[PDB]
Design a protein around this ligand. Structure first.
Ligand code: GTP
Ligand code: GDP
Ligand code: MG
Lengths: 42, 51, 431, 58, 426
């Protein structure tokens, strides 16, 4: 049971890593800028 | 806080600013050329007055 | 919250000021009417309930023929029609007329207008004074405003942008006479004073801007960029922020030495911005370059005491500190024995703006350097010879003695500056 | 000559992409109104560093 | 029970404390609003050590922020977690010190010192049994150093039988961003050495080579640097908030790290940091942890301890783990590197074990080590201070604000006394 729990932990780690790369790709694809951060005549 | 923590995002926002600057300075070149054309027609006009 | 009150005096002062205030109005989203088409404009622009932004500036001259163009230009409505002040009979390139006779009738009314501009401001960082050494109004009238400002306001910050006469060329003949009489009095009541030479602004435009023949109009844009770089820490957020009281304590080591030099880099053409790459190291070696020095003096003849660098744009502290380490490893740049660490750095996030009709390009990252160097003796020693050979026969004095100043002021000016030169050498000597 | 300073009207080309100004409304409020003042009376319960009011008996 | 009041000084302190309290908030499960969003019951058990109770089930932050320029608090409140700070705890001046230790100590710092004197006794007695205070500041400028080193002096007279932490940021020779910086550091440490309990030496040179060579990244902003410093700032006080097999509080660390009252300077370090390219190539086990713990590239200070002697070390571990392994490995490095340790203290190690790791990790550790190599920094600043002072330079900003010339002399003599005390143990 201890060995199976270790294998589960490795699988959860790689799943979280894939999730965070998908999130950085999503925030790369959609970028939102504040109107206070944009210039008034721009 | 995700945007402040990422770094590839910082790389992309460093690149896109340069991609903007290229087009800005290109149309600035176009502005400089039209000012030069204005100076040329000024010189022709003043030569006509001399004649 | 912070603010600084700028005053422009002389024909050189207002001509700089026109390119100056054009730059911030475009920088802060202000139309030439004075309106929008954040509260970051509180450093320069006041607030009116209509939403109007009156600039906190006083335009001073003794001659109305340069002020009336501002009265009839594109910026008629923006400038308040009473801050811009004018006099009569000008000064005619005289220190004595501007100090004693002609300057005394305007000095009461201007001090009302600093008073009327300082009551609104709860916290005051300092005053900026833009003037010229060569002009009579820029010499004599400025020689006692600094006296009246010191006795009115005790320890307020004072900054001077001073048109220093060029070593080779000179517009006037009594220009050395006006320069010495200012540099007799302008020591003990001025917190800082940067020297600008029109000669070195000329060859930089010839070489690094691909333009052959500029005027004063496209000349003050670079002066506007330097003072924009100084005040951009007050106006926008940055990683490292520098105020007026920060760099003045970090540059001048003695009360008698408050004359730094201000180099700017990169100064490049719009067609060459597509060719050059500009890193942090590649823009900070140009400001150390003696060819791009803004004062006609070679720092290789002297030694450095203190430096201040204002990085503006897309910069990181790693490339800054790597470049400072690279500069310190070079044997050409020499620092004094008592100063192992003579650097102070500033970071500003907002990239520089560009003006229509300007000469520069839109650059991601730039820098200006504020350095104090033991090489400006050769400029001071040069007009020391120029004054002495003009003064040898007691010439050009009936236009000064008859106005109301005695003949002992010249000899008192000469011993004061000779004391300044020997104090200047004893600082620069090694232990 | 000095008409050249503002001959050309502003164009949205000639402007930086980033514009991040300072924001001082929150700071100006807490600067205008003072940073607290003690005119209050002393009210702190008596406390012991070892135990607060044990059940000592017998 | 046991409460720590946070104190935050300077522009460097506000930038590093905002990242530090975000790190605590993820560890204890607090949303940016302030309400409790946690998946466990244990996270609320020890919450009064750093949080105060408010209405509606909100935890506010026990922390006072001091400044002289108001341009620093606006970045904090508009920043990531600035909406949780109580607005009455911010204190700022109407003008800046000007990177002058003189202005923040005598002339300008003496007016704002009354207001923070009021707010620090609004939060000191609201607890039950005050453990101690924690100051975070830097020694590079007079805003956080001039105000900080006088705020320490006044609090010690009021609260003597407590513990005082301060995380000093010592100036470095290569990242010297201020000309008058040796003047500020020498005059601050002289007041600091007499009136504090624990000091830590965070050096930006050691922050730079860690984030370049070990983390293997290209753009290290100050937010990333303040993340890695706050990992050691939070990992030291894990025993205060989380149950463990070997708990060790701040005073428990203190009484074994100070053999003498003038010996309270430490070398921090963080073990399990690894680049993302090598994270999957390395097995995270405690012999690998103590291997990476002790090499000279992980210290948060710009000293190499191979030139010095290890005075006393400790390690606070985190996560579910066995302590025969840590006792075997720490005996192994004690017996192997026998030359670098002092012989007048056998068993030079304190060991602490915490059950709960940081989020996203299963095992972690924090290093605190007192060494003789701390005099290497002090002599580097002493020669620069002597070189500047012997030519009568940069003094008109200081002797014109209420100082005689003898205070630099007594500060130089106190530093020379302090360096000579470190010399006899090498
Ligand atoms: N760099 C720079 N210098 C200028 C500019 N305009 C005028 N000057 C300087 O001004 C000097 C000419 O005298 P002014 O300063 O204009 O004279 P004034 O201040 O009006 O004083 P009076 O003419 O006596 O009333 C020249 O030697 C220039 O060096 C300018 O636009 N840029
Ligand atoms: N580690 C760290 N160092 C910082 C940070 N911000 C500034 N510094 C350092 O602090 C020095 C300047 O300190 P300063 O802001 O003037 O301190 P203050 O005068 O008390 O506000 C610089 O050399 C920086 O390297 C930070 O967030 N983290
Ligand atoms: Mg004039």
């Amino acid at each position: 049971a201890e060995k199976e729990e270790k294998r589960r932990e490795f699988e959860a780690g790689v799943a979280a890593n894939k999730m965070c790369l998908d999130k950085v790709q999503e925030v790369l694809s959609t970028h939102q800028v504040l109107p206070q951060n944009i210039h008034p005549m721009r | 806080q995700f945007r402040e923590r990422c770094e590839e995002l910082r790389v992309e926002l460093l690149s896109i600013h340069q991609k903007k600057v290229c087009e800005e300075r290109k149309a600035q070149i176009a502005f400089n050329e039209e000012l030069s054309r204005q100076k040329l027609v000024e010189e022709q006009m003043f030569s006509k007055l001399w004649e | 919250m912070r603010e600084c009150i700028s005053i422009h005096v002389g024909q050189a002062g207002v001509q700089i000021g026109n390119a100056c205030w054009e730059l911030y109005c475009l920088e802060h989203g202000i139309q030439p009417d004075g309106q929008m088409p954040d509260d970051s404009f509180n450093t320069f622009f006041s607030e009116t309930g209509a939403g109007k932004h009156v600039p906190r500036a006083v335009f001073v001259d003794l001659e109305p023929t340069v002020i009336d163009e501002v009265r009839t230009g594109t910026y008629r409505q923006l400038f308040h029609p009473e801050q811009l002040i004018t006099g009569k009979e000008d000064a005619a390139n005289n220190y004595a007329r501007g100090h004693y006779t002609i300057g005394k009738e305007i000095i009461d009314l201007v001090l009302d207008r600093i008073r009327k501009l300082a009551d609104q401001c709860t916290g005051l960082q300092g005053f900026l004074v833009f003037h010229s050494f060569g002009g009579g109004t820029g010499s004599g009238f400025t020689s006692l405003l600094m006296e009246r400002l010191s006795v009115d306001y005790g320890k307020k910050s004072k900054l001077e942008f001073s048109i220093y006469p060029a070593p080779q060329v000179s517009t006037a003949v009594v220009e050395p006479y006006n320069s010495i009489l200012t540099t007799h009095t302008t020591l003990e009541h001025s917190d800082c004073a940067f020297m600008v030479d029109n000669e070195a602004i000329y060859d930089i435009c010839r070489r690094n801007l691909d333009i052959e023949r500029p005027t004063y109009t496209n000349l003050n844009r670079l002066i506007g960029q330097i003072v924009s770089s100084i005040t951009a820490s007050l106006r926008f957020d940055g990683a490292l922020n520098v105020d007026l009281t920060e760099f003045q304590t970090n540059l001048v080591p003695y009360p008698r030495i408050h004359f730094p030099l201000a180099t700017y880099a990169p100064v490049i053409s719009a067609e060459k911005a597509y060719h050059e790459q500009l890193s942090v190291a590649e823009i900070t070696n140009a400001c150390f370059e003696p060819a791009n020095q803004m004062v006609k003096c070679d720092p290789r003849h002297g030694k450095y005491m203190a430096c201040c660098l204002l990085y503006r744009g897309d910069v990181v502290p790693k490339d800054v500190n790597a470049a400072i380490a690279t500069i310190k490893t070079k044997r050409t740049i020499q620092f004094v024995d008592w100063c192992p660490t003579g650097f102070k750095v500033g970071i500003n996030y907002q990239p520089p703006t560009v003006v229509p009709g300007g000469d520069l390009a839109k650059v991601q990252r730039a820098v200006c350097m504020l350095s104090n160097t033991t090489a400006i003796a050769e400029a001071w020693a040069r007009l020391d010879h120029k004054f002495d050979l003009m003064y040898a026969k007691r010439a050009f004095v009936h236009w000064y003695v008859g106005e109301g100043m005695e003949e002992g002021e010249f000899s008192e000016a000469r011993e004061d500056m000779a004391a300044l030169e020997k104090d200047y050498e004893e600082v620069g000597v090694d232990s | 000559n000095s008409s050249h300073y503002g001959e050309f009207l502003p164009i949205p080309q000639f402007f930086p992409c980033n514009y991040t100004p300072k924001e001082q409304v929150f700071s100006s409020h807490i600067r205008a109104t003072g940073f607290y003042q003690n005119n209050t009376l002393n009210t702190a319960p008596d406390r012991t560093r070892t135990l607060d009011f044990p059940n000592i008996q017998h | 029970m046991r409460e720590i009041v946070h104190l935050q000084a300077g522009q460097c302190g506000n930038q590093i404390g905002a990242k530090f309290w975000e790190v605590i908030s993820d560890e204890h499960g607090i949303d940016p609003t302030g309400t409790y969003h946690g998946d466990s019951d244990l996270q609320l058990e020890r919450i009064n050590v750093y949080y105060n109770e408010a209405t509606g089930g909100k935890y506010v932050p026990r922390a006072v922020l001091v400044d002289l320029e108001p341009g620093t608090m606006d970045s904090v409140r508009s920043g990531p977690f600035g909406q949780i700070f109580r607005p009455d705890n911010f204190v700022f001046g109407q003008s800046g010190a000007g990177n002058n230790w003189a202005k923040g100590h005598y002339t300008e710092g003496a007016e704002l010192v009354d207001s923070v004197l009021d707010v620090v006794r609004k939060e000191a007695e609201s607890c039950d049994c005050l453990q101690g205070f924690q100051l975070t500041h830097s020694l590079g400028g007079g805003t956080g150093s001039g105000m900080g080193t006088l705020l320490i002096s006044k609090i010690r007279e009021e609260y003597p039988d407590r513990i005082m932490n301060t995380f000093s940021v010592v100036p470095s020779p290569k990242v010297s961003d201020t000309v008058v910086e040796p003047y500020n550091a020498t005059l601050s440490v002289h007041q600091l050495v007499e009136n504090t309990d624990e000091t830590y030496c965070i050096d930006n040179e050691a922050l730079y080579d860690i984030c370049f060579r070990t983390l293997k990244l290209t753009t290290p902003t100050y937010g990333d640097l303040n993340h890695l410093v706050s990992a050691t700032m939070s990992g030291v006080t894990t025993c205060l908030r989380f149950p463990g097999q070997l708990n060790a509080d701040l005073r428990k660390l203190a009484v074994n790290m100070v053999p003498f009252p003038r010996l309270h300077f430490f070398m921090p370090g963080f073990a399990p940091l690894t680049s993302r390219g090598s994270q999957q190539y390395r097995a995270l086990t405690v012999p690998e942890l103590t291997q990476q713990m002790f090499d000279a590239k992980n210290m948060m200070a710009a000293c190499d301890p191979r030139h010095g002697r290890y005075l006393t070390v400790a390690a606070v571990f985190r996560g579910r783990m066995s302590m025969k392994e840590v006792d075997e490995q720490m005996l192994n490095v004690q017996n192997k590197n026998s030359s670098y340790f002092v012989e007048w203290i056998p068993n030079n190690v304190k060991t602490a074990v915490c059950d709960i790791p940081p989020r996203g990790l299963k095992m972690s550790a924090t290093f605190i080590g007192n060494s003789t190599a701390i005099q290497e920094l002090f002599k580097r600043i002493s020669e620069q201070f002597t070189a500047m002072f012997r030519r009568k330079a940069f003094l008109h900003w200081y002797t014109g604000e209420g100082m005689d010339e003898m205070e630099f002399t007594e500060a130089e003599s106190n530093m020379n006394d302090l360096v000579s005390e470190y010399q006899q143990y090498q």
